[model samples]
Target: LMQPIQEFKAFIESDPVVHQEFIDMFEGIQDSPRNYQELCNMFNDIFRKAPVYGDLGPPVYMIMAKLMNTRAGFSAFTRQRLNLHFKKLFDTWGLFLSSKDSRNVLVADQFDDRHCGWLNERALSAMVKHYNGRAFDEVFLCDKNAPYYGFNSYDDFFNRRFRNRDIDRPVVGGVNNTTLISAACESLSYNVSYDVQSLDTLVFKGETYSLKHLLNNDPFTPQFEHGSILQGFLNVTAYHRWHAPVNGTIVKIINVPGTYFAQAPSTIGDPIPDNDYDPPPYLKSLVYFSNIAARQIMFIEADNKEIGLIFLVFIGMTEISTCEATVSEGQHVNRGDDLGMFHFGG
Candidate 1:
């Protein structure tokens, strides 16, 4: 015995609870007033801002639509809301794709968590440290050639070969000996120590910053291994430019407010400027956040640098004080240009 279509509708759509559920899942405009706009506008304004991938929009919408059709109030407003919802679905999906995790998944089948860390935290550190261990990767080693030679023994041999001889040279991205353009914000410009923290290496204009008392146990207890805590503090100053470490959009800048831990990145001594640790004060303030939104990041390809692209992976999330970034995603930026500045938290 076949049931009538109206009877089938009663089975699914008659229940108010189920009806609202369908509304929220698919045509969620019933949840908000702004959803009545055109589909494209809905995507550009709200849904795109969500922390989700960008590509999975269509499929998710299709599933939502099927469920929405199971109800009757779906037509209470018209198909206008339906179109907008589809757009939002795709936009939200795009956000998810832009994240480091999603990108890694797309690029690698057996993606390692370590790869994600490399984007922002310790990967570059490990890579650079390898050079000190006499185990240089080809990316860092480049070649021992006339114009491209450096201070190393192999490089010395190449430089000697070229001996004051000027010659036409080739140019490309991430060259062997070209200067890395650093992008930093204005506040860090004056704070020498802050500069050291940003770059992660304390080499400002050729002079290397050294650590004085890098105590292993208690960072607060400075036993003076290398020098006074003040000297060590200065050594750890300086930081990276306030720009994107790679080519992407400013998907998000979540300020997790808490106490800022004073350590390697900030300095081994002195508490943060404020007693607050979480949600860096700079991000907490209204003025800096608004300006940061306009900052832009540009990429300049080089034939003389080490990496093809120098990107700002993540700004100081757990850092203390007021750090101002002068660049935003979608804006073209150069390597080693002004990024932003950070200060002590608590």
Candidate 2:
């Protein structure tokens, strides 16, 4: 926690232009609030509001909460607004999680041993609750009886595999049945947009999701002008790994890096109570995030040519740091083959 924050502080102080820009950006919000006493008081505020099952969760989320409530004198408007300083902080946080020291802090913080850890009794029970009647071990490939379920770290447990992909999660119908599309991730279907144009703009709000913007204007953009888009939002607890949704040859892969914590103002304060944060308001603005947040794009030509071209977009939402790919272009993949995995909680 301190490592990344310290690095981010050094990052700001080391550059004259960025430092001035960052200070100017933050000054609009409030005075930068980090200090020894302030940090303690902020955590105190978090402690008062938690086992905060509604909005924020554990420590990392508490950092977000701290940012929202304390830092910058921010209102819902600024919380939803994009800021370079917070983006830098998020970049550092993202980098820190993949480092060795991150594991040490996670262990020492011990939230993993409590509410947030997936393998522990409390978290396992929560997982089972989501499963209805099925037990955790029956679905996921874990020795639930083992300590930390024999998982090395939180990421290891969060990115767990199925006990038997064939038995627990077989292809939608069968691999040969190209008509049956497999789900790319263990996420609830968010939205399916159709007849979308190359430079599409929403008529109601002027919120545009042009293929040009979403694809970062790749060569394939024009071809997909009127193509359909199926967007999925990953539950914080859902499988972060992505799988090939169809039997296809990889046509192209693009990684577009963007924000880690930006959310729509609509998702936060208005048309909803100011303090009532639930059901993860960010889930509502995925189309917005898909345009601006870090994302992975896969353009695939299906084995069954009749099925034609498919565009799979994997978006990294708030707190989601990495969008990784395992397969290269020109590689052939079955419907259920691994594509890649996201690194941590988003």
Candidate 3:
């Protein structure tokens, strides 16, 4: 077992020429439970050596989770073991890297790389491939005549624009009817719950939402105590920009400083079963992270009296922590008007 694991580690550290071969080998190992044991040990050995969870890129971790999630290959025990293994690995780093000071340094460095054209080009290709295609409006896209549509860096590319005419129109009620609502961002709906409370119990449980941590005890937190909460997520391929979900006046804006890589520790010591691994551990914890993670909160006073007010939160996850607000306080915005953007990876 040690010999095979060591051999795979060597392949990982080898020249980029052998990277594809490593991927090929990884696939073969994932084909059965016995082979997967060898693969799992390789990851355990690699993760244990890291101090700050250094150099285990998102791509590598994503693939590891994918392999473990295969439905038919591994026994229930083997799958649970692999799940527990990675959970420990992820939670260890989450706590260590959750500090505001620690994340600020990393977020600052990303700003420096926002203008490198070569890097942007590589990032753009990866983005399109990751998301499966460029599904954005081309008119607002930067000049395609040059490399990466004239994007200076990956951050710049991620925040690409949309034509004003495309998304500016209201959904159905047009300008006169303020009762209609639109999505605040181009995102997949994540969770929605009514009768939400200001404070939540965060005892070790899987996939729970904690509103107190998300709102940071803001002045308007009470407004949402009994109201419905809607949450969603955007991937690297989705539009980074946010929009006004309803025709409203901006009542308040706040940027809450918080952790970046920290996730809910619910799964830390749990006996994860095979089915639980399918959704991916990191994604499972997003509801818990919503409150604790770095986020920008916008309180919109809805024009319709029935709706009253709405909260639009741009919660930052992982490497993307900056949320820039383009609109200001007291500004009146129509539905679909620009709010701001996440600086980089979502």
Candidate 1 residue runs with Cα over 4 Å from true position: 1-235, 239-244, 262-319
Query: Candidate 1 lDDT, tens digit per residue, 26-51?
Result: 44344332221232233334322222
Evaluate all candidate structures by whole-model CA lDDT and list the values in order: 0.27, 0.60, 0.55
Give the clashing pairs for model 3: 213-291, 214-291
Return whichever of 2 and 3 wins on TM-score.
2
Model 3 TM-score on a 0 to 1 scale: 0.59
> Could you arrange the candidates by TM-score from highest to lowest?
2, 3, 1
lDDT of 3 by residue, 136-243 (tens): 334346665554455554445456676543443235556557778888776777888788875555556545555676777777777777778878878545567887
Candidate 3 worst ten-residue window by lDDT: 101-110
Q: By TM-score, how accurate is candidate 2?
A: 0.74
Distance from true location, Cα of 44 in model 1, Å: 48
TM-score of each model, paired residue for residue: 0.20, 0.74, 0.59
Instruction: Report how far off residue 307 is in candidate 2 (Å).
Output: 1.5
**Higher-scoring candidate on lDDT, 1 or 3:** 3
**Per-residue lDDT over 219-337 for candidate 2, one digit per residue giving the tens place of the 0 to 100 score:** 88888887788877676656678899999999999877665554543443323223534444454566765766677888999998788888888887555656778999999999999
